[PDB]
Amino acid sequence: SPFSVKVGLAQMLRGGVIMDVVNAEQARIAEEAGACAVMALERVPADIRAQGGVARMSDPQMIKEIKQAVTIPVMAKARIGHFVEAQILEAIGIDYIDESEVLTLADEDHHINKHNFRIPFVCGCRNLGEALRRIREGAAMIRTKGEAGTGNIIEAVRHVRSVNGDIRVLRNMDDDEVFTFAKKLAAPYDLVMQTKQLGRLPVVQFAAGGVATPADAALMMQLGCDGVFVGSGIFKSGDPARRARAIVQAVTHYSDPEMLVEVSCGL
Amino acid sequence: PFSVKVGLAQMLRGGVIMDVVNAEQARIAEEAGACAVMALERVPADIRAQGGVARMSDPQMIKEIKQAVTIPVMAKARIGHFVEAQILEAIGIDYIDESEVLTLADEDHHINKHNFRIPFVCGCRNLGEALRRIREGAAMIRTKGEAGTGNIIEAVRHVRSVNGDIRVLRNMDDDEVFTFAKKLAAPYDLVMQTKQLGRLPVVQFAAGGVATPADAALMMQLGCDGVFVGSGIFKSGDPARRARAIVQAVTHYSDPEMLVEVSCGL
Amino acid sequence: SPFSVKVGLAQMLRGGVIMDVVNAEQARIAEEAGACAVMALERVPADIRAQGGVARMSDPQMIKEIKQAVTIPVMAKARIGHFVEAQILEAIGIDYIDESEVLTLADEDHHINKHNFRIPFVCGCRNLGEALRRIREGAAMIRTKGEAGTGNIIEAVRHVRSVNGDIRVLRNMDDDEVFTFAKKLAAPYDLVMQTKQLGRLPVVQFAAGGVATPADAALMMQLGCDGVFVGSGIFKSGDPARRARAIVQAVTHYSDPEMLVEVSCGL
Amino acid sequence: PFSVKVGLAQMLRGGVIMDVVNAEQARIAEEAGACAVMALERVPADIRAQGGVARMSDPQMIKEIKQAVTIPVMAKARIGHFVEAQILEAIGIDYIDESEVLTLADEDHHINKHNFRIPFVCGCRNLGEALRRIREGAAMIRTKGEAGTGNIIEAVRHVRSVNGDIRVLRNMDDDEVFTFAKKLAAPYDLVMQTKQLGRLPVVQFAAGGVATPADAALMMQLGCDGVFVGSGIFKSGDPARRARAIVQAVTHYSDPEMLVEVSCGL
Amino acid sequence: PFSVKVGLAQMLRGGVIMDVVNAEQARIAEEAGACAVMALERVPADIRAQGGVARMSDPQMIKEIKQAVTIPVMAKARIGHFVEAQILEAIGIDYIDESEVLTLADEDHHINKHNFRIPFVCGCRNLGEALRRIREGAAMIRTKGEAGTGNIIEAVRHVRSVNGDIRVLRNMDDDEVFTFAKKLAAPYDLVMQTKQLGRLPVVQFAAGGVATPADAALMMQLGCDGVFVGSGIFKSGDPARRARAIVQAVTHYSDPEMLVEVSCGL
Ligand SMILES: *Cc1c(COP(=O)(O)O)cnc(C)c1O
Ligand SMILES: *Cc1c(COP(=O)(O)O)cnc(C)c1O
Ligand SMILES: *Cc1c(COP(=O)(O)O)cnc(C)c1O
């Protein structure tokens, strides 16, 4: 199925770090550090909201410049529900669309019908019900929402533990009780049952929102994530290439405390 | 298969199902043209009014009714009481009604009806309940209406609710259906199937408070496929005549002359 | 340990029906029908309460008469917290004490310290926290509370699904989350972990409270119980031996719908 | 002196006090081994149930009981009714029970019991009440329990409350006792005396709902010095046997064989 | 085993643990007689004041402190951040403080401390928290007190709460301990271990607001085994003198003449 092909594309990112980049120079630093993909975005959405503004899809010109600078896949954000922003992003030829709550909400009641696109989408979630609803709408990849613009990992931990905890509950659950469970989740029963059969989400599951240090990134992986997204904090540093490499190594070697010390020491 | 069970219930379209407490009433119902009978040993309202729990009827009385008629026989199981349903299926009857008229046995879960060979009917008050019962395996849906009153107002409410939300689906933007399924707390695939069909994926009967021929024809004109009627038929001085009147009202629901004739002197 | 010996003794009751009996004649009927034990009690505690009374331990004389009439084990009830009633019952020489909410509560804040006794106890529960607290106090066997004096199975179903559901959740839970789980249950962590490793309660678990028909008894067995308690409704009917045998056969043959029809037909 | 009154009540340790309504019941109580009798003319619950005020009993009936027995005689005065207490003392009885079982006479103040030669017993539900009654001059304390029900649950609550707070005092930092006395609204000197003694400075009996031998032995095992029992003893077919059973249960409270014997066939 | 970690922490009894931000402060602390140092790179209050998340310190600065002293070195991990703890253990330090002074990383769960070789300190405000941290594997307990203020009032509250409940538990009726463990939401087996031991089964230090020699001696007289002190030692004129004063106040906590001498002119 077309959906299964999109799911398979996102599976290539397992074990990877996705980095926010604002120009071609940062994109090249991300790729050279070992990032599995880059997220093109023209201004920090928190800065846009600070001075009274609406955070939208970035200019296609800046996205093209990033796409031309790297070989790894390029993602870009569309406002929730803004299906025309997504049509434009797909027409630019990028690899993934992130339907993102970090941009300004465009439709309070509905997300994009992601099955209408060839390009895979990533969507956020805070619990299993949100994850399965985004998947039913066509998301091929899921991330936590975490907490944007703070560097605080606490919300991403909450979201990971919520999704993983309900998946674990679904494993031993009496089949007869799953109907009421799907009702309470407000999630499609068939996807609930698929998750029960697999013992995990039917798409890759990344951590995002507040992943600041190598320790944070390895924590997410030890909790069971398939990878992590990191924001612009990498490039606010004095040595962005070193900071980016440290996150990549933390995700690749998340169960090696000696490696985590090495990449954290003097950072 | 589920489609086989759905096809069995479709044979009842245009029909009246009658509650019967013994073989004599079952024969009267069949002779009047009922499409099926509902075997039940005592009125659950009298059981509760005397401080009691209304359960599955004795298999012996159910078998006596089944032996007395050729038309299908239904019997009730308490909501969630999957062992009562196993017993009813092993009797050899034709349908199980997982019924809120009996005393609730499981406050949080209904029977997993896909585990059975026999088709089930379940009640509903809105489209969300209808689709959840179908996903659990119900092959036939009825309104809950209002039990033990003869007041049609709740059945009208339930029919208008289910039918109204089905009509809302016809022209709904496909992109909005995901949120609609969330708000209904119903499975998206069944919501989309209902949208494609323009009706419920199973037969839809009125039940609960259907008292007169006018009530029965009202339910048919609102779009139901048939009606259930209770023991009030056998409380009158001429049960055969009253049972026939309901049957004729459902068969001829758009014929006011027939409705006058069967109502006159009833 | 002395506790493990009591817990092991109760295993003999698995697959059995325990019947309330008010005299020696009813006790003989219960044994002849195949009951695994009888529960001696002098009057129905609901009718005592309906008479504006206090329901207590039964007269030792009537309990002894039942014990002398049968070979199967005999249980009798003590009020919750009434450790002296339990001392008297133990001195009678019966086999189990049921510390029972069906009698009038004697201590609002504390149950009997059951480890102080040689005789095993059965206690009720409505959820896993109550079950594990009763076990830690020394209960060697657990039953649901269900709903007394009504014949309505709905509360017993609720209690069975609550206990079994939380055990299933616990079985697959992240070990690191079990500490908080024990806190929220207000149950002893060591017993929570023992239950996690076993995948079931550490003691025999019966259904009780509202089990009225063969269908009810087989429902409890199919939900996972080890046996059932039944009340005096057996002896209110016109053929007590037949109704008692029907429940016993329903528990023995709980997965055989043809047998359940046979014993229910004409009952 | 107060210590003399306290010593009088200590003579009752290990004993059962029985409510009696006439001289015959008083003789039965004494022959059964009661340590004292409580003279009272009518059940205050029946007085209140018939819309009435329960007061001090007629001195004439109290004198008849006192003349019939050698063991001490107690009688009740309404809370705050210091003149009822003056009358009872002038009769020549042995103890006054300032009793919430009778109708409250003063909502805000109890009797100043230090003004009397005769010892008083007062009820309590917690350590604060116990120490306040002692400071007013009570030489003996009982739980209030629950009157007229035969339900032991409130007496258990009161015993566990008083005993639990006494146990809290044993290891309490001396510096925290000032605030503890404030929170109890009890006199600090009596709180400190209770801490030094490890128990109440006066004898402590169970009362209110003690119905069976098992109840009486339960109260003794919880640490009480004795029990009061009501008229239920004389409502049975064999009052002498039931009165003896309670006496034996208190004397032999740690002997389950004795408790079985006196309970069997009771 | 856990008992090895518990026994190791007993070596700190009678000691002062000092926050240090560099190797020079660590050497001053050791020379003044500290029993251990707490390495931390910046004040977590200033990090939160400028709108920031306070995390594990850079391993480089922790290593420099560990290489500067012979006494044990502790460092902080965020609550629930088990990977920060894995890194700290791999550095080779002596204790991890799972610390609410850093930004909470997991709102619902603490670190499973039994998974580590290195001992952990955890904070508490009452006996329930202390016993839950111990069951998770804490080998040492401190009060939370109040961070960044120098106000001892919360540490007094926490010490009095823990010690007060242990004193109550010591004398409690065994039959009541089951309900007590339920109300504490603490493991019954650990509650009983604490009852039999008569104190917390691990070392118990005061922390949070210990500002003066008088404060430090107050905590010791209240029953603590030692104290933690913050960077206020090094924010003054003579750090070596201020560090020595706290050490001497803890060693000589019952000597008012010594407390005067170390406080005079401080
Ligand atoms: C995550 C999120 C949602 C999720 O939508 P549901 O239909 O409730 O699953 C909606 N709105 C906002 C603003 C969000 O951030
Ligand atoms: C109709 C009905 C239900 C329906 O169950 P849902 O899971 O909410 O769809 C539940 N309980 C009772 C008593 C009913 O009558
Ligand atoms: C079941 C029950 C309890 C249970 O006691 P916990 O200490 O809360 O576990 C208490 N009281 C009554 C009346 C009960 O029926």
Ligand SMILES: *Cc1c(COP(=O)(O)O)cnc(C)c1O
């Ligand atoms: C027990 C009781 C009291 C106790 O009086 P305090 O001054 O509060 O100790 C008061 N009033 C009534 C009615 C009582 O039963």
Ligand SMILES: *Cc1c(COP(=O)(O)O)cnc(C)c1O
């Ligand atoms: C001390 C503290 C806790 C303690 O956790 P419990 O599981 O309740 O014992 C939790 N959260 C925070 C933020 C704390 O400071």
